[PDB]
Design a protein around this nucleic acid. Sequence first.
DNA 1: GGTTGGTGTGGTTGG
Lengths: 27, 252
Amino acid sequence: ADCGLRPLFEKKSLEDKTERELLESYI
Amino acid sequence: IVEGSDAEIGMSPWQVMLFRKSPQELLCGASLISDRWVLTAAHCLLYPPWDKNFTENDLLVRIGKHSRTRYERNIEKISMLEKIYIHPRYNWRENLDRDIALMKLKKPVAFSDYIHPVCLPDRETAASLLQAGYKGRVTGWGNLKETWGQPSVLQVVNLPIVERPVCKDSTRIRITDNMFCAGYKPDEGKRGDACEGDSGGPFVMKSPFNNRWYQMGIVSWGEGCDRDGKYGFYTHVFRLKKWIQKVIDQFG
DNA sequence: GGTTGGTGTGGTTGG
Ligand SMILES: *C[C@@](*)(O)[C@H](CCCNC(N)=[NH2+])NC(=O)[C@@H]1CCCN1C(=O)[C@H](N)Cc1ccccc1
Ligand SMILES: [K+]
Ligand code: NA
């Protein structure tokens, strides 16, 4: 289904305050 | 959660609060994995050394919450449990091996901007995301410091996964493949941990491939909270997925 | 207060 996609974030193309820190850790 | 910050509204819509009916008491966190199933840590339900053995009628879950103690009228939803399933090989005698339980809700919960399931990983997602140095995210309403302090809203902290030899050397408790550890090393110059009261809450990771949040871990145990040279331990969700799938398939 | 703080021409929501 749409598991793991947040109505107030991914669904509105908004990022939360600290998810980029997670994205950066893969780099 | 130690050294975290207040969650944003809707930041963790799979977050679940496990509540004892009476006395009324916050027991643990938990996470929503579908409209009918909630995952948590086994020791939140069954821990004989602390005289703890809850069945369905002892408990309720609260979903969609942000405030720790205020009833959030028109936002949060309360669910009774039809049935609890504890992993049959859950080892409470020794090291909390297989620290995992499922709780089936009596009725599906309606989803909202505040209430939405997290994904469980498949083998590929687990292989690619669960590596040392990659960061995930832990949420909860548990203690803000070791006691030896309760937050007013849901707390969040991001923490790196730790190499297994480092996890194993940090503790004399026997670590198994059903666990992983996360947290900064003493001289990494950042801090943060789960703490008592955070058990059952999710360690989640956002996939850079499809932009979804996956629950890789369950807050399980530690020694103190946020100590230098200690790490928080988490139930390894993907490692126990055959059991999760077995319970959902047979009992839904 | 209330299944609930401390303030709302509410809020993550009425009166
Ligand atoms: C029940 C959960 O709230 C709690 C989570 C602790 C997380 N700690 C950190 N620093 N991330 N788990 C517990 O309190 C578990 C339940 C039984 C006791 N326990 C411990 O964490 C002890 N501190 C250590 C332990 C004792 C026996 C078996 C395994 C670990
Ligand atoms: K009010
Ligand atoms: Na630490």
